[PDB]
Amino acid sequence: SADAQSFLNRVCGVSAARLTPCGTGTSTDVVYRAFDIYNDKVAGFAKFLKTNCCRFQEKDEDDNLIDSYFVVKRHTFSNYQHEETIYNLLKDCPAVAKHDFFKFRIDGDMVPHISRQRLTKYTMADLVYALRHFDEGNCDTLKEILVTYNCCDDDYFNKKDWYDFVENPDILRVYANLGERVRQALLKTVQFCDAMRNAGIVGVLTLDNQDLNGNWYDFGDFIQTTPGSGVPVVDSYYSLLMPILTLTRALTAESHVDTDLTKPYIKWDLLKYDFTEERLKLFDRYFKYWDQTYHPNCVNCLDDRCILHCA
Amino acid sequence: NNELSPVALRQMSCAAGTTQTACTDDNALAYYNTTKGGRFVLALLSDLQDLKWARFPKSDGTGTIYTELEPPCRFVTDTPKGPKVKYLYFIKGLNNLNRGMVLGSLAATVRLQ
Amino acid sequence: NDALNNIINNARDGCVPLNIIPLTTAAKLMVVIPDYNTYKNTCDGTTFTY
Numbered sequence: 428s429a430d431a432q433s434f435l436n437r438v439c440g441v442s443a444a445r446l447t448p449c450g451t452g453t454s455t456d457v458v459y460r461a462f463d464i465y466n467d468k469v470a471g472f473a474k475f476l477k478t479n480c481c482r483f484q485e486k487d488e489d490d491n492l493i494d495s496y497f498v499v500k501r502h503t504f505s506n507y508q509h510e511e512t513i514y515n516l517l518k519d520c521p522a523v524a525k526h527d528f529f530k531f532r533i534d535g536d537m538v539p540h541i542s543r544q545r546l547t548k549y550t551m552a553d554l555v556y557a558l559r560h561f562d563e564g565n566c567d568t569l570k571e572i573l574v575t576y577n578c579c580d581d582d583y584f585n586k587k588d589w590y591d592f593v594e595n596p597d598i599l600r601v602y603a604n605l606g607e608r609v610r611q612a613l614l615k616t617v618q619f620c621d622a623m624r625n626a627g628i629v630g631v632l633t634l635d636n637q638d639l640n641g642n643w644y645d646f647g648d649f650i651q652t653t654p655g656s657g658v659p660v661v662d663s664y665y666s667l668l669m670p671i672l673t674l675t676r677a678l679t680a681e682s683h684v685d686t687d688l689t690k691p692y693i694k695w696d697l698l699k700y701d702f703t704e705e706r707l708k709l710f711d712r713y714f715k716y717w718d719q720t721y722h723p724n725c726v727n728c729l730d731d732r733c734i735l736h737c738a
Numbered sequence: 739n740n741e742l743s744p745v746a747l748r749q750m751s752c753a754a755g756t757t758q759t760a761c762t763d764d765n766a767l768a769y770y771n772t773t774k775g776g777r778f779v780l781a782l783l784s785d786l787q788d789l790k791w792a793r794f795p796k797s798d799g800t801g802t803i804y805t806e807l808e809p810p811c812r813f814v815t816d817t818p819k820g821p822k823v824k825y826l827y828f829i830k831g832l833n834n835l836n837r838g839m840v841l842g843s844l845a846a847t848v849r850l851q
Numbered sequence: 852n853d854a855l856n857n858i859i860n861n862a863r864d865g866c867v868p869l870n871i872i873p874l875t876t877a878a879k880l881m882v883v884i885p886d887y888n889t890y891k892n893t894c895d896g897t898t899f900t901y
């Protein structure tokens with residue numbers, strides 16, 4: 428009675444909101460996902476069990492499910508005000524998911540909810556964990572991710588040794604279909620860092636706060652400072668994401684005329700061999716807030732550790 | 739989470755100048771950290787308005803480094819005193835995580851504006 | 852020593868990669884063909900472009 432069919436149209440926003448519950452009523456949903464934790468008593472990069480979330484998938488004209496979810500979760504009232512303030516400071520960035528703060532009663536009391544709109548099913552941390560902890564006995568997440576983004580079809584896995592690199596070298600072509608998604612995620616990350624610096628917000632960026640479309644959320648561990656003096660910490664993010672940048676060949680679009688995958692290739696003259704400025708431009712475009720000096724020529728390095736870092 | 743330095747740090751004391759040996763007695767709330775290998779300062783605060791130099795004494799005394807600073811930032815503080823203004827500095831080359839640490843601790847333990 | 856000199860002088864300091872010297876100054880070309888399908892796509896006819 429009410430509740431489920433009233434919470435549904437309260438989570439339902441003002442745009443189109445053709446929603447369907449993910450097998451729940453007014454209660455939360457439990458999933459098994461990967462996180463990156465550091466909270467003074469636990470640390471690591473493992474798969475924990477999420478507990479406080481209600482998810483509503485979205486439909487469209489022909490009443491078939493689509494890759495869009497409304498995640499409405501429950502924490503603390505102080506956290507309510509803190510997240511509302513930070514989002515109000517950060518809402519104008521085009522790389523931040525659209526939040527919605529409301530209050531709804533489950534009993535005689537009134538509890539607050541925070542709803543995020545139009546997320547994907549999996550985050551970037553899920554993809555990184557799936558590719559860095561491969562096990563052919565159970566790889567359901569990787570297969571689902573591959574088939575939901577038109578990298579292959581469901582009958583591609585009926586083959587045996589479909590994952591091998593020596594046998595079936597076509598898996599490289601299959602993997603190289605996520606590079607554009609990764610590149611757009613990198614660009615949106617740079618945009619988010621610029622917005623955080625301009626707004627005066629201090630926080631650490633993790634892989635599980637970004638979905639596979641590039642949008643950011645979860646400002647629950649941030650603080651506030653004077654405008655223009657913000658500082659993001661992006662060590663673990665880039666360091667963990669680095670091995671995936673070459674498997675998927677994310678920088679293929681940089682060999683075309685206007686960084687567009689539909690135009691012909693760039694025609695460099697055969698007599699050019701320096702390319703010392705292009706490397707700096709690429710570093711400034713994709714790794715702007717990585718704070719450690721980068722030497723395009725390793726003859727200027729200070730020791731072997733710097734040589735490794737720049738190579 | 740990925741919390742920004744739960745266990746905090748301790749202390750702020752000593753000196754500063756603008757041209758090498760201009761550090762006379764004490765012109766800095768040189769802030770934080772006594773690491774496990776020795777005293778290694780992180781943040782500098784200045785009730786003054788323009789400084790490029792400082793000199794923190796440590797251990798041997800003979801070894802006290804003439805630190806190169808960076809262009810400052812300014813803010814006003816919500817102290818019980820009332821109107822109080824400093825000009826913030828960090829030791830040059832301080833990586834992002836350390837500045838985040840000191841800024842978070844300063845903002846979350848003591849009140850600022 | 853005329854084509855080599857012609858491409859050396861175009862360099863901005865006299866240095867050029869070694870991999871483009873045979874590509875722009877050689878007089879003879881040798882092609883090794885595995886099968887006929889590859890042959891009809893590379894050197895079909897009497898003159899080809901490469």
Ligand SMILES: Nc1nc2c(ncn2[C@@H]2O[C@H](COP(=O)(O)OP(=O)(O)OP(=O)(O)O)[C@@H](O)[C@H]2O)c(=O)[nH]1
Pocket residue numbers: 458460461462477480482496498500546547548549550635636638639644645647648739
């Ligand atoms: N893409 C996606 N991720 C989900 C979904 N449900 C749960 N998650 C994961 O669960 C988390 C829910 O977000 P938050 O709870 O705001 O973020 P958090 O990383 O747990 O941080 P804290 O809230 O501070 O603990 C996300 O970070 C995701 O990694 C979903 O439907 N889609």
Ligand SMILES: [Zn+2]
Pocket residue numbers: 720721722725727728729733734736737
């Ligand atoms: Zn180097």
